[PDB]
């Protein structure tokens, strides 16, 4: 046939072609989240957009290394050092450091999250940008684990609106990865999600992540169509554009026939 038929029942993911100046990396916004609040982050509305109704703490731009690996301090006999969670023991010590005198249950201040000084123990963050596939095919995004709650969304009208990266969050709960902390306990059902992407189109990407206490962990990866995996460092794949709500042609509803 002269032309491709298109994905069935307009099933292609919406993408974008922003015409402005591209910037490397994602924007990270930080919002207040209460220490030891084990319920707010279990609501889909909160993780999709309600986080932005809490106080905005600040932001950092241009971030390409997007995984989270926050370790609380151990105040030890030889000084204060971050403790890998698997090395914590007893009530409590950190392997190779002895007993720790400090509480696992208080807020801690650090620049560990993207250089931004905040409380990684208790915070919500929103990562936004556009994913640029170099290859047409199936991409599988993953979280290796989630501590405490997280979502990943891909696509125009799902992550955010084309050419409108900096706007308040949209209300879609059609997450690509639903890593929301269950009300009962541990292990959302599925922490991978696959998206079919066409090379050279910009796909809106949003990650919302929350920690309520102590350790924070979100190892982000993507499996490319060629079978290789990109983990943590998304340089060359993720970009930002300043809003341009005037760019009439920015939205590509069906990259399968554009
Ligand atoms: O899954 C909840 C929480 O579990 C673990 O935190 C422990 C401790 O560090 C906290 O102070 C108390 C607060 O009541 O909870 C647990 O005993 C960690 O895996 C933590 O990261 C996680 O959020
Ligand atoms: Ca829309
Ligand atoms: Ca935690
Ligand atoms: Cl020890
Ligand atoms: Na860790
Ligand atoms: Na430390």
Swiss-Prot record:
Domain observations: The number of the intragenic tandem repeats varies between different S.cerevisiae strains. There is a linear correlation between protein size and the extend of adhesion: the more repeats, the stronger the adhesion properties and the greater the fraction of flocculating cells.
Functional summary from the UniProt entry: Cell wall protein that participates directly in adhesive cell-cell interactions during yeast flocculation, a reversible, asexual and Ca(2+)-dependent process in which cells adhere to form aggregates (flocs) consisting of thousands of cells. The lectin-like protein sticks out of the cell wall of flocculent cells and selectively binds mannose residues in the cell walls of adjacent cells. Activity is inhibited by mannose, but not by glucose, maltose, sucrose or galactose.
Biological process according to GO: cell-substrate adhesion; flocculation
Record-level GO cellular component terms: cell periphery; extracellular region; fungal-type cell wall; side of membrane
Applied biotechnology: For many industrial applications in which the yeast S.cerevisiae is used, e.g. beer, wine and alcohol production, appropriate flocculation behavior is one of the most important characteristics of a good production strain. The ability of yeast cells to flocculate is of considerable importance, as it provides an effective, environment-friendly, simple and cost-free way to separate yeast cells from the fermentation product at the end of fermentation.
GO molecular function: D-mannose binding
Highest taxon of the lineage: Eukaryota
PTM summary: Extensively O-glycosylated.
Location(s) in or outside the cell: Secreted, Cell wall; Membrane
Covered range of the whole protein: 23 to 271 of 1075
Keyword annotations: Cell wall, Glycoprotein, GPI-anchor, Lipoprotein, Membrane, Repeat, Secreted, Signal
Positions of the PA14 domain: 61-236
Protein name: Flocculation protein FLO5
Glycosylated residues in this chain: 122, 174, 190, 249
Segments for region (Sugar recognition): 184-227
Family statement: Belongs to the flocculin family.
